[PDB]
Every structure is written in structure tokens, then in C-alpha cells.
Amino acid sequence: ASEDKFESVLSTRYCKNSPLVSILSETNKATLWRQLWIWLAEAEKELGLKQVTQDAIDEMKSNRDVFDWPFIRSEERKLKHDVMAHNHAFGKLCPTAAGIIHLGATSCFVQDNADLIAYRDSIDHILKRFATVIDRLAAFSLKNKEVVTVGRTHYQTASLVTVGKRGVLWAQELLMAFQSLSEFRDKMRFRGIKGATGTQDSFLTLFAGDESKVEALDELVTKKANFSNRFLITGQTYSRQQDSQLVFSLSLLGAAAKKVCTDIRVLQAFGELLEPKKNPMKSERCCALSRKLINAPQEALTILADQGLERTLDDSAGRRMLIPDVLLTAEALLTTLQNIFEGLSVQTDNVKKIVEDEIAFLGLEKAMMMLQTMADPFFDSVRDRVVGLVNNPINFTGRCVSQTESFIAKELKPTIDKYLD
Amino acid sequence: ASEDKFESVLSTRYCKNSPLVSILSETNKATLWRQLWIWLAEAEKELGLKQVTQDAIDEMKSNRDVFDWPFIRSEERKLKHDVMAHNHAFGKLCPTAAGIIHLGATSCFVQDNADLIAYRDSIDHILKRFATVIDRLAAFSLKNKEVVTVGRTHYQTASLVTVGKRGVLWAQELLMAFQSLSEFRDKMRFRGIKGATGTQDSFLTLFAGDESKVEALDELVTKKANFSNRFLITGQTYSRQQDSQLVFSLSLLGAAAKKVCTDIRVLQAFGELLEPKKNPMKSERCCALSRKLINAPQEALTILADQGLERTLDDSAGRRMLIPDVLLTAEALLTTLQNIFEGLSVQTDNVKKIVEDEIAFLGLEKAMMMLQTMADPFFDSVRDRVVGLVNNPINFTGRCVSQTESFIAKELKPTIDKYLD
Amino acid sequence: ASEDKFESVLSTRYCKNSPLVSILSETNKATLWRQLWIWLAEAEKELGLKQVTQDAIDEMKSNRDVFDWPFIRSEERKLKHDVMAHNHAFGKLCPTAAGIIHLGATSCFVQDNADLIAYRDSIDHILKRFATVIDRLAAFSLKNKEVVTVGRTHYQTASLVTVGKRGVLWAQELLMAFQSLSEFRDKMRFRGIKGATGTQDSFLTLFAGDESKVEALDELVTKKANFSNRFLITGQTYSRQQDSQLVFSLSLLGAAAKKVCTDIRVLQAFGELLEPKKNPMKSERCCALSRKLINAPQEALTILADQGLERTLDDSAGRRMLIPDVLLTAEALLTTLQNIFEGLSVQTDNVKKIVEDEIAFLGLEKAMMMLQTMADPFFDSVRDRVVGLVNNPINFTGRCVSQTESFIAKELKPTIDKYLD
Amino acid sequence: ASEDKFESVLSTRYCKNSPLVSILSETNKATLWRQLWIWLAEAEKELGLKQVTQDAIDEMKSNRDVFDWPFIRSEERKLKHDVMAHNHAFGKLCPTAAGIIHLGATSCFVQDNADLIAYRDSIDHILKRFATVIDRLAAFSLKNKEVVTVGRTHYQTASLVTVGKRGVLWAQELLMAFQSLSEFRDKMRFRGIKGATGTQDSFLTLFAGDESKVEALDELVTKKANFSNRFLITGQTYSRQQDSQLVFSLSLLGAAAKKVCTDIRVLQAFGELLEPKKNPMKSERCCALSRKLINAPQEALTILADQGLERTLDDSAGRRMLIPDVLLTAEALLTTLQNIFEGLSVQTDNVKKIVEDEIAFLGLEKAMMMLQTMADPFFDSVRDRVVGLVNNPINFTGRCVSQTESFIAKELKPTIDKYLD
């Protein structure tokens, strides 16, 4: 039974229905390794390396998805190198191509580039879910753009705002995180071909000293992998600073989400909101997931700081554990946020009452600045105006309404629209 | 295929042969929940609560290890509460005991206490492995207690030490971490019975207001669970400050191990040591695992800081992901350290040469303080003494030898001996 | 003007009246360096090193507190080594002792040991303030041991507790932090004399090879410095793992305090408490200070992990910035907590009302378990009992009262009493 | 004496000559507060608020830099609010303007906006120093673009590279950090006018309900403060997510710098480089400073996550301590890096020898791939080619040379050139 052994709670519970569970699986990674060896073979052939035949390539393409795990496992045992084992395994499936698989390339060629492909694919799915989450929150905000409630500083009544303005305040936190992850996705650079230390000496020799062919190969493989950007300067691997940026972008989602979810939990305790005695359990799961993403950046940064010269392998086990975990955690977090925003509702009776218990004083503070219970005379020059505000709280909310609408129409939608359907 | 879905690399790779994979499994946790309900039932009966019959208890004890996962899963679906689902499931297996299962107790009774039992058991196994690791390092140190090499500050020659003194320097870092985890294990407090908010009101009513019976029950269950200490004051759960201490103790192992492994990696690069071109891959895996434990404390501390009043559930998902991960990471780290120390060896030819290229100058520095190539006269009062040191480097190492032996005999062994066999 | 240049906000604002500002000053550190050179001189003389005369020692003791900063500054310039500069400066003040100052010792002798003395002294003051803080909270708890209020899970009504039980829940968090810092203080180990790499070779030669004299000197200096424990095994410095423990203990205070202060801020927002519209500004400052201590442990752990072989100086600037900051932050935090607990009060009218709006339902839940508005019949066997609970909420709080008293009398007081007056 | 009290080691030692010490001083902050009140007054007047006279504004502009600290201090005492105290103080200096100072604005108006101005100014200076640092490293790299040395993986010989390629590898890490901080600087958004809760209700009333005037005022003040971007949506303060981005950008500098400095420290230990027995003390200070920036991001992220609703003040003390510290630490780090790169040199004799001891084997590995000591026959088809590589190591470095030049000319210079002179 699967329950008899420790299991990833993210994979088996919080993200069981996410495509990330497939994207980040060993099978998909090994598949990407083969796909990369395929593209490498195709590009080298296209560039004149005759030793790579079309028959060899056809075997590779035909057997890309065929995995003999029992065999692969024994191979990873005889020789303690996964890449070598998989190359050997792929070699036995494609005997004609066996000799040219990974020709001139380093193991890091498939390892690093497969991670980048797996990561970006995962990020693309996260971005679609992210957009939906933000869209749901925008819907909630518009729906409540004119529902008055008390603004709070130190968690205490400070003025009057609208549920919608606050909804947009939360929306902005999430939108800025979205924009960060969105920009990271556009700027992500592919490693391409760089050799074992980054000099490309093996490929150069392979091309009899022609550097333009080495550059063309690097560009060609990058193009096949569907990347617009690639590193030109590297050691054995692409800069781990790129991974820090990846983790940080997701940590922004965590910080933003935790602020939003804690607000909802507090507001629910105040009796103002109700997430889909009713406990805000979804919001609490949201804070737990968010807390994890928030505490991840410093490890990624330390990984970079710990990289020795052209490369030290103290990053492998660390990257293998860290990155897939944050990607999945972010997805589980977004799924939760989506549930919350789809059914989040306002306890209008409680909100109206909270507003009524505070509006007299906010009115008094208002009269004092402009300078019922104000028949002195002394408020004679501001009595009617204040009374009007008290009978129409919405006029006590400054520009909450227009701010809410313009932000959504001119900033939020234009930003996420391209990710929604 | 298991490879087709994301898997915990710790569970499936770095710790596949560890009993922690069984101890931290869902099956073991659910089993502990049942064991706790059993002990609760036994204690309540022993204390006079007649509603708990021996037949009910016998059903429970007989069916403790019988799991109908397909049923349990559907139950966790109809009702979104694992504990309730498992209670229901255990109830169907024991129809006579169904009505008294968890009588007066809260879900946290099994949840919190099962974690504590699972954690301590895991810690006990970690401590046995830890002791073996330290023992191996002590063996290495004794073997090299008189093998001279250069001491280094800023990674550069500063004097002469012995490989063994350095081995004991590393041993102390690990021993202090061991002592921290060892003390934490002895001081760990059980939650026992506390009710949903920590007042024990349900048990009090159950005992018709007799507080001594409530206290006796709390003590009795703690005794059955094999804990010498228990909290008296709590909210719904036992203080998450205890979990911070747990994570911190393991972070000490990480800091210590990373310092040791980085030293070995650097020494191997210098050509002085060789872990079992030879790359220090095991030491690198050690730094990656260590880095993870080092970056965990702040999350545990934040979990405590985030706990609201008697309890907020923003800690569950967080604890479920954090603690089992650090426990497993520590075990994988210790397994690696053990491999390293069992076959770590000294490249005596290289060490001897490094010592020879530096000993002339260390000798010169020595003569200068006491005040061949010193025939001036000027060194006439210290020439023979220095020459003697250069022909016998070991006499240039101060008290390295006695320090190494006394530390091992009087501090290291007495501390770990009780955990070795 | 001092305002014209960046200033430490801790030193100039949050701790301006604390003795830590004097204890952690450069003058006190240099003074400790001189005191250490004095003790070293005395011990070496007591052990037979005739070159150290009583006249030399008298100069040193007489001029220990005389600082010519302008001169010292120019000296720290000509030669880029503070210790050497101060030795030179102290040498000019004591021309007879100039030649034997720091005889056989390394710079780290004064640096590391002065830090330990400064740190422990700072910790002792922190412990006295800590005890007072806990004492104030215990006073508050006893005063409210029978003031009923609602218990909360997910920040929502879950039962009835007493303000005092909650006060003791907070008290325990702080007490466990206190015990950690208190134990660290008792176990703190002195570096003593160890040489530049930890072998004590210089002192050995100084004593003509007699190791017992080296050990006696190490013990003697430790005794003069008033330390019961000292390291026997070290590299150039004492293990930075000790500093991690120091920072972690203070991080426990931060986690505990933040949980307590956040609870108070939330309770004040609920209208249940009032710290000395009233905003909980002191509690907010408490969370900010606490947050800083919580985010410090991982840096200290990384410092240890980064230590290369016998020593790398990448820890100096880091330690100089980190440790004094956490010590001061903890003191500022404790001062704030003290203010809060001395005037914290309960809004009894609001609490009574909150209890009344919830007690009917808690009563209903109570009747359901035991099995006005219960005249069915159906509650006929529990109507009077529940009605009694509703007319006497205190009987609805389980063992809150006895738990509060026994914890304070048997755990809290015995622990802090020795630090209060 | 200043030495008699704890001092900021950054302000008094590591950055004593930096303009950040002036920019981040209390005097400069209070000056910015006054400047902001001045701009607010000017804009409100320009927009029709007649109550603001030109005489009032002239007093303010004339007395902007006049500080009566003794008075200000007593004022900060009578009333426990710095902003109110400074307003009062500025009011006494400008009796005609006293009544309209900060008209309609919140304290956060000067607090938040002054921080943003102080921060950006500090960042601008950091960017100029950063550019110089990168320029120095590029100079070093070009100078050594053809100096061959061994490439290293696991800190061990893996191939041949050029000192310059490695220099450019380091340069890229720093350049990516530079680009991050550079982009953050361009995107930084001003808070502008938003009211106490973000609704701008006070300004709206002040403009008799005309929203365009409120928007114009917000835009006008932003323009006067010299900001191209401003937030439209906020609570009381501008999003603390912006501060997380600020801290993270600087943490990138720390991660990059630590990787670079650790490499230099290791290379110096190998005898390949020498920073300006020679210990790499500057590089060690660099790692200590870098470590601090690396461990800062998570606190900034937690600050955001902890922000309650429109605002909670648990961020003030935290921000006041965190941000100025990282800004100064980054400046001290850059100053150190600059020193290092200006005099960093290669120990050409040692490098040449290290290359010679390894080039035979690298040659053997090379021959094996293409398929003296190779006279078999068996190498007959590759003997001359390999021999040529061994007599000309530079041809063994793949594309190191062209990569180094193109990166510097096409990526590094175009990026930093605008910041150098």
C-alpha cells in the first residue's frame, strides 16, 4: 500500500490533480533528456556532422517515450551516474544511434536544460492558474465596489472604505507577484551547449575549429527547445542566480497571499467575511503554504553563493529538493486561493452594524476637519454635510470606487487577460 | 509506473532503506491514532468510566492494524476531516466500541500525540545513526592522531597540526549537535489530554468534576505512550516552540556537517584527503543536505509566532511538510557522513610534501619567537632545537596529540557510547 | 550634530538607557582586552614565567582604563590590525610591560574571550529584565485567573477560558525561551588560551614542553575571567556553534514574544484588552523587534557552516554586526514587553458581553455531550446543570483556574525567582 | 567619547566616507519631511487652495534646513509622535504657515515618501559604485583574457580556461545583480498623497469633491519629488512588497559577491591569485558582508505578509532597522570589491606550473575523444594535434577568449557605461 511509506503530501494530496505532478516526474525528466539528445543530434546533423545519420535519429525519435525502468534501475546501480545510465539505456533501444548520442555534450546538457524546460512548463501552468485567481478576486472586488465597511489601521477602525477597494488592495499584491513571475518567464535563459566547463572546447574540436558552427549549434538547439534567450557565458551550468530569481518570484506570491489570507482570517473573525461556527480553514491552509514559499529564497541564494568556480555539485540534491517543492507549493496555494475567491462572501448584516457603531465618530472627526448630535451651534456650518455622510456612508469613502474600477480596468485586466482563455 | 508522477526524492532515493520511511508513513500515523484511542479507552476504564467495556477495548486492540484504505478514502471525502473519517472507519471495525472511541478527547489528541511519538521514534533512530557517525570519525581521528599536516587560517598554512586533531575539531562540532538533539529527546513533552482549547472541560464533566481524575488520566495516557514528561499548560495543541527546538537541533547537525564536509572538499582539492580524478561527491551531497537543515529553523520559529490564541490551523500543512522533511534529510545526511568517514583516507605522500614545503618557514618563525640555514651566528642558541623540530614535525604540533586522545576518551565516547550497540 | 549622520536606532533610541550600550561599546571591549592581557600576565607569572615582573603587571592594572583614542586611531591606521594597535598603545602606557604583553598568546585570545565576556554580561542583564517581564505577566495572570472570556480557535469562539489561563499560556512561551537562554548562560564555554591554530604550541615552548603548565594556564585564565567552563578543543577560535546557540535562544524569545504580542493586538482589536481609539503600538513595536530576532538564527548557523578549517575570517564583520544587534534587540523587546504587562488591562464590559453572546450556544454544545431554551423535554436530565453553567460561566472553564495557579507557583516562580531581586 | 557607547560599525567604520551616512541620517530624513510638506503646500496652492499663501511657503523654504534639535527632542517627548513633533517644530519656525503645514495629508505622507526618496538616492550612489566595481572586474578580465589556467569542477582540474573567462563568469553574476537593482530603481513607485487609509477622502473634501484635483495633486507632488511612477492603489502606506524587491535585489549582489569572493579566497589558497603569507582578508570581509545581505530577504517578505488590512505599525521599527542596514552593507561590500579588483593579480609562475602538471592528462583525454608519450602507434592520427595543444595551452581553452570579449563589449559595457562618468 502507498500509505505504508512516506509520501510527498504535495504530490499525493495538495496537487494530485495538477499537471505539475507529471511535468516534474522522473519519467518526464528522462523524456526531456532524450528529447534534448534528439535535438542535439538533429542540429549537429543540420550543421554538417555526417556521423549523425537520419536512421540513428529516427530510432531516437521513435523510442523517445519507451522506458524499461527495471533495466534503467539496474544500470543506475552498476554505474552510479543517472545520465550515463539513461544514455546507455537509450543506446540499447537505438543501437544505430548509440555511438552518437550526446556527441560532444556534457551530462549537464540534458540535466540543466531539462530542468529549465520542466520549470518553465510548470511556470506556464502556474501563470494560467494565477491569472484565474486574480480574475476571481477582481470579480469579487467589482461586485463589492460599493459595499461600505470600516477601514482599519492597527486592526482598528480608522475610516470607511469599500470591501472592493480592499479587494483591489489584495489584488495588487497578487498582481505584482504575477508580474514578477511573468517577467521571469519571459527572461528565462536556456543553457544550450557549453561543454563541461563552459568553454565548448569539445564542440569546437568536433567542428574542426569553426566557432560560428559552435555558436550556430548553441542557437539551433536553443531554438528547437523553444527558448528565445540563452546564456552565452557559463561554467558547467547556467547561473544559479536564475534559480534564485525563480524562487524569489514565487516567494512574492507567498508574501502577498499570506497578507491577503491573514486579512481574510481576521475579517472572518470580526464577522465581516465568510470563506466558502465557520472557520477560515482554506485561508489557514493558504498561510501555511505561503509561509513555506516565503522561507525558501535564502536557500536558493545560498546555493549560488556556495557554487565553487566553474561548478561544485553541492547544488544538485539541493536544487532537486527545493525547486520542485516551491513550484508545487505555489500551485497548491493558487488552487486554494481560487476556491476562496470563488465563494468568498460578505456578511452584510454584520458589516452594516460595524459601520453604524463607528460612523458617528468618523462623522465627528470629519466635522472637526471641515472646521443630530451637532446642534450646538458650532457645527451649523457643517451639520448638514456630515448628516448627509452618515445617511450615505458611501460618500465617506473618498475615491474608493473610482480607484477600484480604474485599477481593475487599466492595470489588472490588461495584465492578466492574455492568460485567461 | 511510480516514475510517471512526482516523488519525494528523500523517501524514494536518499532514505529508501530507512525505517523513517515507515515511521513517517500515513499508515503508521493512523496506527498511532488508533493506539492512542486504545490507551485513552484503557485509562478511562481504569479510572472508573464504566461505559468503556473490555469487549470494546478488545475489538480496538484486535483491529488496530487493519486498514481498509479504499473505504477510508471515500470517508475522508464525504466528510472533510481525516480524524473523523478514521474514527468512523475504526468505528465500523469495532461496532461495540464505536460509541466510546475518543470519548471526551479532541482530534488534536491523536494528531498532536501521534506526531510526537512518530517524531521521537524517528529521533531515536537518528541518534543511533548519529552515534555511529561520530564513532567512525573518532576512529579516523585516532588512526591519524600523529599524522602531521599543515594547520590553516584563511585556508593558508599557519602552523602544523595533526590530521587527528582536525578530525576531533570536526568531531566536536558534530558531538555538540548530537548533545543538543540528545537533550531535546530527553526533555520532549507529551501533550496528553487537554481538550479542544486546553481546559480539559470535557474530561472534567466526564469525571463529574473530579480534577484529580482528569490529572490522573493525563498522567496515565502519558505513561502508556511511554513519555516521562508532558505539558500541563496548553491551548489546543502542545507549544510549537517545542517543534522549533526540534528543527533547530537538526539545523545544528547541518551547520556542523556542512563545515566538516566543506573542509573535506577543500582538503581533497588540496590533495590531502580522499573520500571513499577523484571528486568528493559524497561530501557535496552532504553540503546540499546540510544546507536544507540550516534553512529550516526560521520557518519553525515563524510557525510559533503565527499561532493565534489557543490555536490557528495555519500550522498543519506547514508542520506536515516541514518536520518530516528535516527528520528524513538529517537521516540521509548521517548515512552519507557515515559512508564518508568509513573510507576517508589521507594522501600521505601529498601531505608529507606540503608539510616539507612549509616547515622551513614555520621553523624560522619558531626561532624568532624563542629569541642548516640558521648558521649565522644569531640562531646559535636555538639552531639545534629548530633543526630537531624540522626533522620531527610532530614536535611542532604543540598538544595536538594529547588533546585528540583526551577529547575522545573523556568527552566523545562517554557521550555516544550508550547509543552504540 | 549626531543627527547629521546615520545612527544605530537601537543604541540611540530603543536601548539608550540600557547598560548594554556600555557593555557592547568599543571602550569596554578594549578594556576587556587589557583585562585579559592582565590576567594572562598574572597567570603566567604565577606559573613560573619570571620574565613577567610585578612592576610590569602594576603598570597594566593601573593604566587599564586610560584610553588615548586619537593615538589609538592613528595606530590602527599605520598598522591595519586593531589588536596590534591596542597592544602597541597599551605598551606605550606600560613601557616596563611592553615586551611581555600577550606573551605567547594570539590576538584571538583577547578578541574571542572579550566577546564571550561582553556577551555573557549582556545576557545576565537580559535575564534580569526577562525575569521581571515574566513576573509582570504572572501578576497579570493571577489578577485575572477568574475573569472568564471566550477561548478561540481560528480566532473564533471555541469555548470559555479565563484571561489568566491565556496569560499563563503566553507566560509559558516566554518561560521556555527564558529557560533556553538561562541554560545557555550556564553552559557557555570560555576559549581560554589555545594559540593561533588551537595547538598551544607557543605556550608549550614557553613552558619548556611542560603540558600541565599549559593546561594550568588555560584553567587559571579561565578562572580569573570567572568562567566555570572552557573549551579544550578548538581551532583558532571557540566554536561558532556556540554563537548559533546564543542567537537561537534569543530567537525563541522573539517567536514567543511575537505570538504573545500578536495575540494582544488581535484581542485589543476585538475590544477585550487595552495595552498601556487606542492602538496597540507597544505590541506592534514588540512584533517588529521579535521579527528581527526570528530572522537571525540562519545567519549564525551559516557563519559556522562557512568556517574553513582552523579558521577563516569571514566571520568577524559578520559576528560584529549580528550578535551585538540581537542582544540589543532582545533588550529593547523585553523593555517593551515589561511596559505592556505592567499596564495591560481587561475591558470587562466588552468581555462580559462577548461571553454572553456566545454562552448560550456553548451551553447547547455542552448539553449535547452530557447526552430556559431547553424546555423540551429532552434536556430534562441536563437542563439545570447547563443553566447553572450559564449563570456561572467560570464553571464552564474546566481546569483553567487550577492550571493557572499551579503553573505559576510550581513552574514559573521557581524558575525566575532567583533573577528577581 | 564616542567609543564609550555602542556604535553602528557600518556607519562609523565600513561606510564612514559614504554619502549614505548623510542620506540615511535623521537630519536628512527630517529635511525630506519638510521638503515634502513644502511640495505639498506648493501643489495645493497651484491647484487653487487659497488658504496656502506664498508668504507661508517662503517661510517654509527659507527655514527648511534649520534644526533646533534640543527643542525637537523635548517635543518628541511631550507628544510621542515624531512627525507631529517635527510639524510643531517646523510650525514654530514658520508661524504664518503653521496652520497649513501638511494640510489634508497623513504623517505617512512624509514618512513613506521620505524613505522612498532617501532609499532611491542611496540606490543611485550604490549603482555608481556598482558600475565602477564591474568596470574594474572587466578590466582585470580583459587583461587576463589569454592567461591560461585550469578550469575546476568540485574544485578540481576539469579542463583549461582563461583567468579572463572566469573573470567574466564572476562579472556576469555581479552584472545580473546590477541589472536587477537598476531595473528596481527605474520601476520604483512613489506613494504620493493617499490619506490615512488610502482613500484620499481628506483631500477630496479639501477640493470640494473634485476628484481630478485630488489626482492632479497626487501627480503634481510626485512630479516635484522627481518620480516618474507612483502607486494609485494603497492602504495607508505604499506596498511593502516594493521593499522586499529592494532587499532582494541587494541580496542578489550578496549571493553573487559571496560566490566571487569565495572563489578568490580558494584560488588564493591554491596560490593562483593574490588580492591587494598573504591572506585574502578583503575577500573574507566581502563574504561576511555578502552573507548579511543574503539573510535579509525573508525578513522583508515577512514584513509584507504581516501587514494587517490597510496598515499595522509592526513594520516601522522593522523597516527602520532593516533597509538602511542593507543599503549600507551593500555600499561597504561594493567598496571592498572595488579595492579587490583594482589590485587583484595572478601568480603567473604558480598558474603556469599548475597547468603543466595537468596538461598531459587533459591532452590524453583530448586524444581519446578525437578517436611524446603517444608514440604507440594508436595516436598516430592525433599525436601532432595534441602535442600542438600541449605546447600552446591557449588552444586548449575552446572559446574562452571570444566569449570573454564579446560578453564585455556587447553586454557588460552597454549595461554599465551610463553609470561610469
Side-chain angles (χ1 to χ4, degrees), chain D residues 95-243:
Chain D
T96 294
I100 53 78
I101 297 182
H102 92 271
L103 182 61
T106 291
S107 307
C108 201
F109 172 60
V110 297
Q111 285 174 153
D112 261 27
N113 285 303
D115 293 331
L116 292 168
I117 293 179
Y119 296 166
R120 193 177 71 175
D121 285 347
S122 298
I123 287 174
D124 285 330
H125 279 283
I126 285 173
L127 284 175
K128 292 181 184 180
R129 176 119 291 172
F130 209 149
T132 295
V133 166
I134 292 174
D135 176 88
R136 292 302 144 62
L137 180 49
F140 171 81
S141 299
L142 281 173
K143 177 187 181 171
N144 296 285
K145 60 186 165 67
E146 289 166 308
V147 175
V148 176
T149 191
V150 298
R152 300 171 186 274
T153 60
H154 313 79
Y155 284 137
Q156 296 191 306
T157 301
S159 66
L160 295 186
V161 301
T162 63
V163 174
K165 169 57 184 302
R166 179 172 288 152
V168 152
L169 177 59
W170 297 331
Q172 177 171 61
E173 288 308 322
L174 293 168
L175 189 61
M176 299 187 277
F178 178 92
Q179 301 173 309
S180 173
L181 181 63
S182 180
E183 179 177 324
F184 172 78
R185 195 290 183 189
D186 301 324
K187 295 184 173 186
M188 268 194 96
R189 285 129 88 180
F190 199 63
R191 171 184 182 283
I193 58 154
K194 296 298 186 289
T197 60
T199 73
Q200 301 171 312
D201 194 58
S202 294
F203 290 108
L204 189 56
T205 295
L206 206 56
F207 284 117
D210 186 331
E211 294 203 13
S212 66
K213 300 186 92 64
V214 176
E215 187 59 32
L217 177 61
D218 193 27
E219 185 188 313
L220 202 42
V221 174
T222 300
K223 191 172 183 300
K224 289 177 177 296
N226 213 52
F227 267 71
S228 296
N229 316 125
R230 72 187 150 90
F231 279 107
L232 289 170
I233 295 299
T234 76
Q236 175 173 298
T237 72
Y238 66 80
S239 181
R240 298 321 191 197
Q241 188 174 318
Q242 192 172 77
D243 288 341

Side-chain angles (χ1 to χ4, degrees), chain C residues 78-223:
Chain C
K78 293 192 174 186
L79 41 86
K80 275 62 180 181
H81 287 295
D82 271 55
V83 177
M84 196 186 310
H86 272 274
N87 179 285
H88 186 67
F90 196 36
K92 284 202 177 185
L93 282 174
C94 312
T96 294
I100 53 78
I101 297 182
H102 92 271
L103 182 61
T106 291
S107 307
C108 201
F109 172 60
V110 297
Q111 285 174 153
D112 261 27
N113 285 303
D115 293 331
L116 292 168
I117 293 179
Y119 296 166
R120 193 177 71 175
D121 285 347
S122 298
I123 287 174
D124 285 330
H125 279 283
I126 285 173
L127 284 175
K128 292 181 184 180
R129 176 119 291 172
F130 209 149
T132 295
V133 166
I134 292 174
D135 176 88
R136 292 302 144 62
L137 180 49
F140 171 81
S141 299
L142 281 173
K143 177 187 181 171
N144 296 285
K145 60 186 165 67
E146 289 166 308
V147 175
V148 176
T149 191
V150 298
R152 300 171 186 274
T153 60
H154 313 79
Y155 284 137
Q156 296 191 306
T157 301
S159 66
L160 295 186
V161 301
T162 63
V163 174
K165 169 57 184 302
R166 179 172 288 152
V168 152
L169 177 59
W170 297 331
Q172 177 171 61
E173 288 308 322
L174 293 168
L175 189 61
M176 299 187 277
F178 178 92
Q179 301 173 309
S180 173
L181 181 63
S182 180
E183 179 177 324
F184 172 78
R185 195 290 183 189
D186 301 324
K187 295 184 173 186
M188 268 194 96
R189 285 129 88 180
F190 199 63
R191 171 184 182 283
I193 58 154
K194 296 298 186 289
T197 60
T199 73
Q200 301 171 312
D201 194 58
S202 294
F203 290 108
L204 189 56
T205 295
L206 206 56
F207 284 117
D210 186 331
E211 294 203 13
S212 66
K213 300 186 92 64
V214 176
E215 187 59 32
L217 177 61
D218 193 27
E219 185 188 313
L220 202 42
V221 174
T222 300
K223 191 172 183 300

Side-chain angles (χ1 to χ4, degrees), chain C residues 177-303:
Chain C
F178 178 92
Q179 301 173 309
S180 173
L181 181 63
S182 180
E183 179 177 324
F184 172 78
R185 195 290 183 189
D186 301 324
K187 295 184 173 186
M188 268 194 96
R189 285 129 88 180
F190 199 63
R191 171 184 182 283
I193 58 154
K194 296 298 186 289
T197 60
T199 73
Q200 301 171 312
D201 194 58
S202 294
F203 290 108
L204 189 56
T205 295
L206 206 56
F207 284 117
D210 186 331
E211 294 203 13
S212 66
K213 300 186 92 64
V214 176
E215 187 59 32
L217 177 61
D218 193 27
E219 185 188 313
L220 202 42
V221 174
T222 300
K223 191 172 183 300
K224 289 177 177 296
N226 213 52
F227 267 71
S228 296
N229 316 125
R230 72 187 150 90
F231 279 107
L232 289 170
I233 295 299
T234 76
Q236 175 173 298
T237 72
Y238 66 80
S239 181
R240 298 321 191 197
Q241 188 174 318
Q242 192 172 77
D243 288 341
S244 297
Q245 187 64 58
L246 188 167
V247 181
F248 180 65
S249 285
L250 295 181
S251 71
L252 283 175
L253 191 209
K258 192 158 180 291
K259 183 277 192 294
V260 175
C261 288
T262 300
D263 275 355
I264 291 173
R265 289 165 50 211
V266 171
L267 286 170
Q268 191 156 320
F270 286 148
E272 288 191 47
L273 298 175
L274 262 188
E275 68 165 48
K277 65 161 64 177
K278 304 306 180 304
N279 302 307
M281 308 182 106
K282 297 178 196 300
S283 287
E284 294 171 301
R285 182 194 286 304
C286 162
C287 296
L289 291 167
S290 294
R291 187 183 296 109
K292 178 172 167 54
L293 298 170
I294 293 172
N295 284 262
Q298 279 168 42
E299 202 186 324
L301 290 163
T302 300
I303 291 181

Side-chain angles (χ1 to χ4, degrees), chain A residues 24-85:
Chain A
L24 299 166
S25 62
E26 167 162 33
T27 293
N28 189 51
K29 301 308 302 299
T31 298
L32 288 174
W33 288 2
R34 289 180 176 180
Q35 187 54 269
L36 284 158
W37 281 323
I38 287 170
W39 289 327
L40 180 62
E42 306 185 324
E44 297 181 326
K45 181 181 179 59
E46 286 176 45
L47 292 178
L49 293 195
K50 303 169 188 176
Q51 52 269 62
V52 178
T53 70
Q54 185 59 56
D55 286 331
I57 291 175
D58 292 331
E59 286 181 350
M60 294 170 80
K61 290 167 67 179
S62 190
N63 294 319
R64 194 199 67 179
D65 304 307
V66 184
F67 292 97
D68 186 314
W69 290 110
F71 171 60
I72 296 173
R73 292 309 175 196
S74 71
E75 277 308 306
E76 289 180 345
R77 262 129 52 183
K78 293 192 174 186
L79 41 86
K80 275 62 180 181
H81 287 295
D82 271 55
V83 177
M84 196 186 310

Side-chain angles (χ1 to χ4, degrees), chain B residues 8 11 13 22 49 55 87 95 127 133 163 241 296 369 385 401:
Chain B
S8 162
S11 172
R13 179 175 181 181
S22 298
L49 293 195
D55 286 331
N87 179 285
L127 284 175
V133 166
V163 174
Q241 188 174 318
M369 297 309 285
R385 197 172 180 185
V401 179

Side-chain angles (χ1 to χ4, degrees), chain C residues 35 38 42 54 56-65 90 94:
Chain C
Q35 187 54 269
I38 287 170
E42 306 185 324
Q54 185 59 56
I57 291 175
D58 292 331
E59 286 181 350
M60 294 170 80
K61 290 167 67 179
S62 190
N63 294 319
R64 194 199 67 179
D65 304 307
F90 196 36
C94 312

Side-chain angles (χ1 to χ4, degrees), chain A residues 160-180:
Chain A
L160 295 186
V161 301
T162 63
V163 174
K165 169 57 184 302
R166 179 172 288 152
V168 152
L169 177 59
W170 297 331
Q172 177 171 61
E173 288 308 322
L174 293 168
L175 189 61
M176 299 187 277
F178 178 92
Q179 301 173 309
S180 173

Side-chain angles (χ1 to χ4, degrees), chain D residues 310-326:
Chain D
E310 285 69 43
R311 212 282 176 75
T312 41
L313 276 58
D314 53 301
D315 68 322
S316 284
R319 290 174 70 261
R320 192 165 183 175
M321 298 186 275
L322 181 62
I323 304 173
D325 283 328
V326 292

